[PDB]
Amino acid sequence: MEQLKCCSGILKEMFAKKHAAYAWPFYKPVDVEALGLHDYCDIIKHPMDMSTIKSKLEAREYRDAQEFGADVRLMFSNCYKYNPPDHEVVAMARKLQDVFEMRFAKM
Numbered sequence: 001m002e003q004l005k006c007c008s009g010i011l012k013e014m015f016a017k018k019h020a021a022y023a024w025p026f027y028k029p030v031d032v033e034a035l036g037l038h039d040y041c042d043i044i045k046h047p048m049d050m051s052t053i054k055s056k057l058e059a060r061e062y063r064d065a066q067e068f069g070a071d072v073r074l075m076f077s078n079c080y081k082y083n084p085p086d087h088e089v090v091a092m093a094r095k096l097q098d099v100f101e102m103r104f105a106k107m
């Protein structure tokens, strides 16, 4: 699909140096053990991160751009659900979501 190729472009933008200052906590799965977030799995039923989405896209796990978009939004929603609203990581998620929503709207 043409729109799935657009999804590869979306990930390249989200992983780019321009956005690294706020995107970096979303690059890989939340490491509950190293971070001491032992209540994370009690709140978050479906963890998601950018590396997992990249692997799913490459393995043809998304039928269309809407399925890809749902996993990106799941990653943001997990952050908004788990953390207090004033947390530094929530502000970072919002800045990354701005990048994603503007690009996703172009297709």
Ligand SMILES: Cn1cc2c3c(c[nH]c3c1=O)CN(CC1CC1)c1ccc(CS(C)(=O)=O)cc1-2
Binding pocket: 024, 025, 026, 028, 029, 030, 031, 032, 034, 035, 078, 079, 082, 083, 088, 089
């Ligand atoms: C998505 N996310 C991510 C983090 C996180 C934290 C609390 N709540 C979340 C959350 O919701 C603690 N901090 C926040 C960070 C300073 C701004 C870190 C630190 C390192 C990593 C990468 S890792 C591979 O070591 O997990 C992730 C996260």
